[PDB]
Design a protein around this ligand. Sequence first.
Ligand SMILES: CN1Cc2ccccc2N[C@@H](CC(=O)O)C1=O
Ligand SMILES: CN1Cc2ccccc2N[C@@H](CC(=O)O)C1=O
Lengths: 315, 315
Amino acid sequence: TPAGPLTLSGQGSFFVGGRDVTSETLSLSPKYDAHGTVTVDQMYVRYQIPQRAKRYPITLIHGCCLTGMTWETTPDGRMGWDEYFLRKGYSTYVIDQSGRGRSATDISAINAVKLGKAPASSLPDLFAAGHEAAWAIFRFGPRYPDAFKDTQFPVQAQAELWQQMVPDWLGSMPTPNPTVANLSKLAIKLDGTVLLSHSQSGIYPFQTAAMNPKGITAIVSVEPGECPKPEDVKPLTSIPVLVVFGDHIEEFPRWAPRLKACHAFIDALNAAGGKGQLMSLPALGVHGNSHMMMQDRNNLQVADLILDWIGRNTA
Amino acid sequence: TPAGPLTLSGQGSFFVGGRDVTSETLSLSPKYDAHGTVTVDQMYVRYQIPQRAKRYPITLIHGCCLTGMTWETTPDGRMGWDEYFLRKGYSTYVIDQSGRGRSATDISAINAVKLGKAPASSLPDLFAAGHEAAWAIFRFGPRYPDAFKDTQFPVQAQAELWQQMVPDWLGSMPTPNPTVANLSKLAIKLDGTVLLSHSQSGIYPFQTAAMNPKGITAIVSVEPGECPKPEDVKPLTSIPVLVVFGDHIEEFPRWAPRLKACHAFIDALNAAGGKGQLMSLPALGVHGNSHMMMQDRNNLQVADLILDWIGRNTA
Ligand SMILES: CN1Cc2ccccc2N[C@@H](CC(=O)O)C1=O
Ligand SMILES: CN1Cc2ccccc2N[C@@H](CC(=O)O)C1=O
């Protein structure tokens, strides 16, 4: 944990993309006009630039049920990857996905239903993760609230983890998510960035690269919900890819086939003349990591492994 | 404008408050369990600590239809108050209100209706500000898209301002807003903070202080939607109060009575033995400021006026 002060050459915030929508259900009060134009699908980006920044920034992309908070102070109060990457001399761009956190949703259809201007079927598909289900999906232990004896997650700060979990609007937006096109715009503007994503967003950087490879220096995908199909690897052959998996995988039916499918993806990518690696942490002698490995007690060691791979693959 | 790098003694993020809710409608899907517990009403807080930080941090509290992005890089890419306060030696705590931005809402009621289990009238009360209506409320000009000739707002970056506007769930939360109790918990934990709020949240610090004055060093309220009533000043007489108004007020029926009512508040506060000041920017020879004065082209001059008062009233 590099202690002491942190010096920033630059910092700021901006949005990427967005579309203007005409609505007639913005308000339910006669005090406000229900007719107007709003901007939706834009992506919030917060950036920090260290002194003597390395050539390529890292863009950090959270998964479901969470925001860019994912990468900030861990639930138990320790340094997160955002601060760590900065201290290691990488410029960092931390997003909130379209329709999440500080990135605006459209509430038009909800108010439409409440006003009678649309049927209940127009209501968006929404999801929030309960503590009990999250426990098992995160692989903290076999069932809530029992932890694996060797878990790296600070389970004593479980209440704080729950504080950072939010409703997810993914199901009410297209596939690919508008985040995908926004990530292409960001990478082009930056003229080269490493895209580092997680879980729900694990597939995003591959989808972005398939849309337009420009500006995508490398991909790091942490325990993705899905990897690209073996037959889809051709457009990816020029971009170094790292897929990272933690521990206690085989005991979970949700996770075991994903690791298997990701191995198949990496193998096919490499067979096609590409450059992929499946980093399994237990195979490297690093044990106990949860799905929330960026927040685990050895999160900086996990960061080092990833950063070493980035350094060797962006030279 | 202060140039060059910025050094931080520390930075991080955490949440304040929250309550657990058991819901039967967290999901619409047969895959994911619709029954579970979520945490709602927690308040996101991002802090930065400069070297040799002043004794009292400033807590920045956004208004409606917006998030803590309010105080970050302006829409046209210039330094915001958050960075500026840091450079002037103040620790800053920038929040997302409960139920806004990175602070979780409960989507249970929306899913219940989509599942046919509850009627459309049970849907939450949601609002979004249209560009055209916001233009007039912000006082950029009389009606969209005509700008006052002397406006301090960077109207050329209106598109970027629209990107940072988001749906507002205030109507579906209790009163006082859960943000109020969370600001007390924050102020007490910090053992003294200046609360600086805006518009919708203009009243929040006063409600907080009347609830519990502990840790509230001073209040700065920027163009509040309401000031306390003259008869309600007695819990506030030991806390220095600044209320700030910009320009082009009298031509707007929304705004003219709020200035007048805030004058009555301040006069009665002083008369009850308190310490209040209504800072009217045009009365100080500062012209053209909009409702979004923290984003205006002279935003650092406005900050200087505010910081001068803070310095003199916290010594
Ligand atoms: C961050 N995260 C973990 C997660 C936690 C709780 C509920 C779902 C869920 N889904 C995953 C995605 C998936 O496994 O398909 C996710 O994105
Ligand atoms: C940030 N902001 C300005 C605003 C802009 C657009 C719509 C409403 C609205 N309400 C105000 C509150 C009010 O005037 O009662 C607000 O918070």
